[PDB]
Amino acid sequence: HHHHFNLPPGNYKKPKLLYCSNGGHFLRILPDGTVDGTRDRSDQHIQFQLSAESVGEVYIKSTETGQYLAMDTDGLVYGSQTPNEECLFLERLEENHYNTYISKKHAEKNWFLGLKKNGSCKRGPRTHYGQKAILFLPLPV
Numbered sequence: 001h002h003h004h005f006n007l008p009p010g011n012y013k014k015p016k017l018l019y020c021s022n023g024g025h026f027l028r029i030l031p032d033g034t035v036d037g038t039r040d041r042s043d044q045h046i047q048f049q050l051s052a053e054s055v056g057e058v059y060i061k062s063t064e065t066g067q068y069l070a071m072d073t074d075g076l077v078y079g080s081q082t083p084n085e086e087c088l089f090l091e092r093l094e095e096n097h098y099n100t101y102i103s104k105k106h107a108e109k110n111w112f113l114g115l116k117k118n119g120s121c122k123r124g125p126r127t128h129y130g131q132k133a134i135l136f137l138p139l140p141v
Contacts, residue, residue, distance in 0.1 A: 002108050006093040007056055008138075015049045015063050017041075017139040021098070022132045023117035029062040029069060033079035037119040047141050050091075057104060058091045059083055071103040075111055075124020089113065098135040 018027040025037025026046040038046065047063040060069035067079035070086040080087055088104035101113040103124060111124035114133035122133055 002110075003090060003102060004092065005056065008091065008093045008099045011099075011138045012050050012052060012058075015047050015141050017046055017141055018048060018060070018099075019137045019139050020115040020133065021135045021137060022115055023119055025115050025119045027069075027113075027115065027136070029065060029067050029079040031065055031067075033067060033081075035069065035077045035079055035121050037115040037121070039119070050138075053088060056091055057088055058101075059087055060089065060101070069101075069113070071106065071111060071113070071124055075106070075126075077113060077121045094135055099138055100134050100136070 020037055025039055028038050028043060028045045029035050030045055045064050049061045049063050051059050068083050068087040070080040071077050072086060085105050089101040090104055092100050094100040103111040106124060110128060112127040112134045114122040114127045116122055116133055127134055
C-alpha cells in the first residue's frame with residue numbers, strides 16, 4: 001500500500017549476517033536486548049534467522065539469543081523476547097541489489113532499520129529512502 005513490491009531473492013533457508021554497507025557493520029542483538037552494529041565478524045550475536053509471515057513480511061530472529069528484532073513506538077530498535085506487531089518488517093529490495101527493512105507498524109512513516117557509520121542504530125524518524133544506512137546485504141554465516 002504505502003510501498004513498492006520489489007523483493008530480494010529468497011534468504012530464509014539458512015541463517016544470515018545482515019551487513020550494513022553504511023559503516024561496514026554487522027547488525028547485532030545483545031542478550032540484554034540492545035541492538036547495534038559491530039565490525040567483528042567473530043561476534044556470536046550477529047547471526048539471524050529470517051522467516052516470512054506473509055509474502056514480503058519477515059521476522060528477524062537472533063539464533064544465539066532467540067530475540068526478535070523490533071522497533072518501538074518512539075522508533076527505537078530493540079530485541080523482543082516474544083514476537084509482536086513491532087517485530088514485523090517489510091523486506092524489500094533497494095537500489096536493485098540491497099535489502100531494506102521497513103517497520104510494518106510504522107510503514108506509513110517510512111521508518112527503516114538502519115545503522116550509522118559509528119555502528120549505532122538509527123531512530124525510526126531519522127531514517128529515509130536514499131540513505132546508505134538502510135542498505136543491508138545478507139551474507140552467509
